[PDB]
Amino acid sequence: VNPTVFFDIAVDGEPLGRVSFELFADKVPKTAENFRALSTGEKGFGYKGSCFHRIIPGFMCQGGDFTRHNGTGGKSIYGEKFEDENFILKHTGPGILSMANAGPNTNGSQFFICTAKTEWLDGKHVVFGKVKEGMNIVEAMERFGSRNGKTSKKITIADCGQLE
Numbered sequence: 001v002n003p004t005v006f007f008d009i010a011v012d013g014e015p016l017g018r019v020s021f022e023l024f025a026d027k028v029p030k031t032a033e034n035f036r037a038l039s040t041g042e043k044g045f046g047y048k049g050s051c052f053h054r055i056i057p058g059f060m061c062q063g064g065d066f067t068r069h070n071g072t073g074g075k076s077i078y079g080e081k082f083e084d085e086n087f088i089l090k091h092t093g094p095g096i097l098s099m100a101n102a103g104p105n106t107n108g109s110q111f112f113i114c115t116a117k118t119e120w121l122d123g124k125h126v127v128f129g130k131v132k133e134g135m136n137i138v139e140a141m142e143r144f145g146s147r148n149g150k151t152s153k154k155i156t157i158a159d160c161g162q163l164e
Contacts, residue, residue, distance in 0.1 A: 002026055003162060005039040007047070009137055010158040011144065018115075019134035020163060021097055024089065024127075026110065030078075031085045031099060031107065031128040037077045038064070038109055039160045042087075045075070047105055047109070052155040055145025061138060062149075063157065064110035081106045086133035089127035091118040097129035102116070115142050 023032035050066035067073035074091060076082050083105040083137040091098060091114060098121065100110035103139040115138065131138060144153045 003032065003036050004132060004164055005036055006160060007157045008159040010156045011141075012156075013156075015158065016099035016140055017068050017134055017137035019137045020132045021129045022132045023097075023129040027088050027130045028085045028126060030082070031126050032111070034076050034078065034082070034107070035097075035111065035128065036162060038066075040162050041160075042111060043077050047157050047160050050146075050157050051154055052141060052151065053156075055142060055151050055155065056144050056147065056149050057142050058116055060112040060114050060116075061141055061145070062110065062112040062153075064100065066107075066109060067161050068120075071110070081108055083107070084126050085128075087123045087126065090122045091127060092126070093117045093129035095135050097131065098125045098127045101125060104157045113137070113138055 002025050003023045006018050008018050009016045025032040033078050052061050052063035053070050054062040065074045092117050096114040099107045144151045
């Protein structure tokens with residue numbers, strides 16, 4: 001019953017592969033719904049064509065800034081920002097999907113995919129999904145990051161949507 005969404009990832013425009021995520025609507029429905037809708041584009045804006053602007057190997061891949069492409073933009077389907085829904089779920093390891101933010105109750109559209117356990121983020125970032133399929137594609141993306149997060153090739157969501 002939890003929704004599944006996919007990203008088709010490209011590297012300098014070349015198709016890399018597909019990542020699919022289970023969104024934990026059963027535990028964080030509001031946060032899951034934002035990501036789901038941004039992935040289908042059904043509100044007239046969303047993730048299709050956007051980039052992963054900050055990738056730090058051994059840490060995470062961050063994306064979702066579909067307005068400014070650099071970590072300074074993005075918006076939710078509820079308004080520019082929405083609240084931290086809950087912190088039930090923890091950053092337990094690679095594959096965890098969690099909201100980026102700039103303070104309490106500042107969720108927009110930016111998110112990160114963990115490539116390591118990031119327990120120090122527990123209670124600060126809302127975990128709302130996990131990679132279901134294509135963690136290998138996330139690992140391939142990760143290799144284009146760097147210590148300071150700048151990517152050496154352009155990592156984009158060439159297509160995205162809902163499966164099932």
